Amino acid sequence: MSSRKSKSNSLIHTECLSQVQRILRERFCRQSPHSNLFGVQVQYKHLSELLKRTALHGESNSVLIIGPRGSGKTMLINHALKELMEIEEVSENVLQVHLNGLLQINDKIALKEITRQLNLENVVGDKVFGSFAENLSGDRTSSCPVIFILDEFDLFAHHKNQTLLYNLFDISQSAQTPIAVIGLTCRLDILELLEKRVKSRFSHRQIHLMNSFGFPQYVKIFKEQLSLPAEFPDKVFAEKWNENVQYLSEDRSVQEVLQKHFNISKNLRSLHMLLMLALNRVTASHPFMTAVDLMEASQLCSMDSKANIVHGLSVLEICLIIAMKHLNDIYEEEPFNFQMVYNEFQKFVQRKAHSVYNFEKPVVMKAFEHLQQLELIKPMERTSGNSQREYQLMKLLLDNTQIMNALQKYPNCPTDVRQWATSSLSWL
Amino acid sequence: MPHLENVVLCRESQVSILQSLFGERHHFSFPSIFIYGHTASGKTYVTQTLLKTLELPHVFVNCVECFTLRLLLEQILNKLNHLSSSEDGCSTEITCETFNDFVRLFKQVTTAENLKDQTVYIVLDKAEYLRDMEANLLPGFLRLQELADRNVTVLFLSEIVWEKFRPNTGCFEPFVLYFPDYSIGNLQKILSHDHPPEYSADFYAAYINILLGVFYTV
């Protein structure tokens, strides 16, 4: 009696990792209640005192939340709305309209899609095309007040005098039921982005939800995302999970990766890719973690994407990008067409023995056209329609630094070609 | 197997990457996966074979065939109702043009037991002509996981690099995957695998090596 529990334990190890992938991936993009606050305890009390003034009473407030995107700004507004769910004597009388400014681009469409969330006078069908005129606005009604939620104040911010935001600012200042409005935006200053008729009619209340961490308190964020709650069927495997992270948190190679991404982008979204890529490597043969599965996942997402595209080329297009590099040193910032590159093509054929390396003529335009579909050249501002294979006045989209460092790593480099690229053309 | 690995013998480090992101049916992933390659044919031929092997719900649409946003969102639903349930939906068409109604009608289709807790793949062929239209359809697929709230993974098979379609107000930063280039030691073996039955293996592979050294520079 021994060949039963050992074989059954292997099946649990293959199924326990499946329950973690459906939580970590549903935590970065999708907002999960397991994620608590991150140094925003003082801002949590400010938004809590404003929401109770509308649900419990009838005082509507409109604030502006400025931060990153859907991974950082959605950690406080949605948490305050879910706090209203515990008290069932108000959650059943207050609905919620999920709006998004990224979808709406004009103003006529917004007057019809608003009825798709309330559904108090129509059906699956939408009523007459009439633009809404009476939007229902003694301060005590039984029509279930609904709070609207906006997002992305950038698309409709530059429409036509913003005729949509002025309606929401008048319902709370009307005479029937006050309706609040809480939105999300990434751009900092938003107040001055409106006209004077809307600027003088605002609450002028905004909070800058910007993280201000460093290095000691930054490690706690890396360990909090990997701290799964008490949901595993076996509590023995849950103790070794949190303990293994502590052994890797203090390491000469793990701490170097954390500080490299923190200086580039300290946003929480930039760290989401550093936690899910390492989970993909953990399959059915990785019982624990180490400092090897986390270093290879950070290099593939940080290599020079503008220097590795030249390795899968031949010699024709490789000699072309070096030809315009030599012309940039003698022509100090000025456009030039393609026919000038053909003048030096028949110049390198000299000082060489008679062999089979010489080409013809139509291969030159075919080798240069391959760079057109790669977007390596950019016109000054206009692409002539009647331009042929002589008038292009194109330039370059690279630099004089990565072109020289991409020569020793290129596979199979000829000896009579590399010397021509390093020199400044001193021979004929 | 006959067209997944025999076409390119240099994908040993990429099979374990795509299969790790798939997992099971109830497993999720990023709402957008940008994968750019070369020649616009190497990454396309491997996609038609890997998806037809594991038998997964997936479609194929193109942005070059249609120059309007009304026809792009229509062809996606035309290839979805045929595999949305176990039977056909009596061959019914969809009349829509509003971009806001696209996320509303897509949730009603993904309600059956076939697309309830399963991963849906959206392969966007030739994803380098989206900047000609409007600058609002780019972040629509990056935040589709939050709006639609469905297991939808949008794939990209474009020639342009990722750092060229950056909008004015920014968008979501996904995972940029780069397939390895055609190695010199592996390109010789893939060009000799499709040998005709009139010859053999060693006798046919000798006629390829004599042409590779003269056509590698051109």
Does B107 carry a binding-site annotation? no
Q: Do B146 and A273 touch (CB under 8 A)?
A: no
Does B44 carry a binding-site annotation? yes
User: Nearest by CB to A102, which of B29, B38, B143?
Assistant: B143
Domain CATH number, residue B106? 3.40.50.300
* B123, B125, B129, B131 alpha-carbon torsion, rounded to 10°: 10
Q: If you search the block for the tokens 């399963």, which residue do you land on?
A: B118
Q: Which residue of chain A has the CA closest to B182? A: A312
Resolution of the coordinates, Å: 6.7
Three-class DSSP category at A185 = strand
Q: Do B26 and A25 touch (CB under 8 A)?
A: no
The domain A18-208 is classified under which CATH number: 2.160.20.10, 3.40.50.300, 3.40.1190.10, 1.10.150.120? 3.40.50.300
User: Nearest by CB to A312, which of B99, B103, B181?
Assistant: B181
B68 vs A: CB within 8 A: no
First to last CA, chain A: 86
Integer CA distances (angstroms), A89 to A56, A77, A85, A274, B128, in order: 10, 21, 9, 43, 53
Q: Do A314 and B172 touch (CB under 8 A)?
A: no
Distance from B69 to chain A by nearest Cα, in Å? 13
CA gap A185, A152 in Å, rounded: 5
B201 vs A: CB within 8 A: no
Are B187 and B211 in contact by the 8 Å Cβ rule? The answer is: no
**Phi, psi (rounded to 5 degrees) for A20:** -85, -35
Domain count for chain B, please give it: 1
CA gap B17, B177 in Å, rounded: 10
Q: Do A412 and B175 touch (CB under 8 A)?
A: no
Beta strand pairing status for A146-149 and B32-36?
unpaired
Burial of A124 (0-12, 13-18, 19+ CB in 10 A): exposed
Is residue B205 one of the residues assigned to a domain?
no
Three-class DSSP category at A384 = coil
Is residue B1 one of the residues assigned to a domain?
no
Which residues in chain A have their CB less than 8 angstroms from residue B101's CB? 113
Cα A213 to its chain centre, rounded Å, is 20
- Which residues span the domain enclosing B144? 12-178
Binding-site residue set of A for ATP: 67-74
Cα A386 to its chain centre, rounded Å, is 40
Q: Do A29 and B24 touch (CB under 8 A)?
A: no
Is residue B147 one of the residues assigned to a domain?
yes
Is residue B65 one of the residues assigned to a domain?
yes
Query: Positive or negative, the Cα torsion across A153, A154, A159, A160?
Result: positive
Q: Which two tokens stand for residue A31?
A: 């907002």
Which residues in chain B have their CB less than 8 angstroms from residue A155's CB? 136, 169
Q: Do B176 and A315 touch (CB under 8 A)?
A: no
Is residue B183 one of the residues assigned to a domain?
no
Which residues in chain A have their CB less than 8 angstroms from residue B160's CB? 374-375
Q: Do B217 and A314 touch (CB under 8 A)?
A: yes
Query: Positive or negative, the Cα torsion across B196, B197, B199, B202?
Result: positive
Is residue B132 one of the residues assigned to a domain?
yes
Half-sphere exposure of A285 (CA within 13 A, CB side): 1
User: Nearest by CB to A155, which of B26, B29, B136?
Assistant: B136
- Where does A204-235 have alpha helices with state H? 219-225
CA gap B89, A329 in Å, rounded: 66
CA gap A47, B135 in Å, rounded: 34
Are A219 and A245 in contact by the 8 Å Cβ rule? The answer is: no
Burial of A7 (0-12, 13-18, 19+ CB in 10 A): exposed
Integer CA distances (angstroms), B211 to A314, B192, B207, B215, B218, in order: 15, 12, 7, 6, 12
